[PDB]
Curated annotation (Swiss-Prot):
Its EC number is 3.4.22.38. Keywords: Cell membrane, Disease variant, Disulfide bond, Glycoprotein, Hydrolase, Lysosome, Membrane, Protease, Secreted, Signal, Thiol protease, Zymogen. The chain holds residues 115 to 329 of 329 of the full protein. GO terms for biological process: bone resorption; collagen catabolic process; extracellular matrix disassembly; mitophagy; negative regulation of cartilage development; proteolysis; proteolysis involved in protein catabolic process; thyroid hormone generation. It comes from Homo sapiens (Human). It catalyses: Broad proteolytic activity. With small-molecule substrates and inhibitors, the major determinant of specificity is P2, which is preferably Leu, Met > Phe, and not Arg. Belongs to the peptidase C1 family. It is found in: Lysosome; Secreted; Apical cell membrane. GO terms for cellular component: apical plasma membrane; endolysosome lumen; external side of plasma membrane; extracellular region; extracellular space; intracellular membrane-bounded organelle; lysosomal lumen; lysosome. Its main location: other. Thiol protease involved in osteoclastic bone resorption and may participate partially in the disorder of bone remodeling. Displays potent endoprotease activity against fibrinogen at acid pH. May play an important role in extracellular matrix degradation. Involved in the release of thyroid hormone thyroxine (T4) by limited proteolysis of TG/thyroglobulin in the thyroid follicle lumen. One of its GO terms (molecular function) is proteoglycan binding. This is Cathepsin K. It comes from the Eukaryota. The gene is CTSK. Predominantly expressed in osteoclasts (bones). Expressed in thyroid epithelial cells.
Amino acid sequence: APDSVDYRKKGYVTPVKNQGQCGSCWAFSSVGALEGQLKKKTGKLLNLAPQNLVDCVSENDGCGGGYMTNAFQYVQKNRGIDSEDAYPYVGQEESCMYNPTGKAAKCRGYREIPEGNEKALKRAVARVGPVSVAIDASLTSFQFYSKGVYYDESCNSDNLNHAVLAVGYGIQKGNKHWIIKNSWGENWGNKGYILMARNKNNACGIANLASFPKM
Ligand SMILES: *C(=N)C1(NC(=O)[C@H](CC(C)(C)F)N[C@@H](c2ccc(-c3ccc(S(C)(=O)=O)cc3)cc2)C(F)(F)F)CC1
């Protein structure tokens, strides 16, 4: 693996979205990972539809929350996921409105990073593309993040409560980090992004529930 990777520089990452009041972080994380793979395989960067996942993944809970792996499994079984343009995000759960005519990506399964293993997570990011990850994002320190590499000793890996997207990793002024795309809009963090401590004893549980789709 390279010392640093940033998939934004390769055009693998769509603009930061805002999930609003709906608990659809998992859907944004999932589409982000699918978007990276779609770009890598086909050359196309496009917004995929988190609404498609919110409404149609029966083993998730819509705006009540969900798992990224359930979303990948759905896309595989469904034989597709719609584009954002074809199935727009409305910020609350609707009836399933999937239409194969608006299909923009497929999924051939998924893979899980060995739990707790940041080296494996780094290898996955390097070899595959953006990876879906789960973190404890409950702390005010996370809410108020602005610059530098984020670390809070109170972050609790038993409290995985938020899904985001690891789009790269590197080092800033000697501090190793993960480059994380959030779905809280561009006015949160650094234009919607946060640098989170890497190789610091699995800070915030970042390597505890990481996964990526096959395509
Ligand atoms: C995101 N806005 C949000 N967090 C989550 O959705 C998190 C994300 C992780 C996976 C930590 F990255 N997941 C939560 C969650 C997972 C599953 C369900 C769920 C409930 C009920 C059903 S059902 C309809 O009864 O089959 C299915 C799935 C809810 C929440 C977490 F609890 F953290 F695991 C804040 C919401």
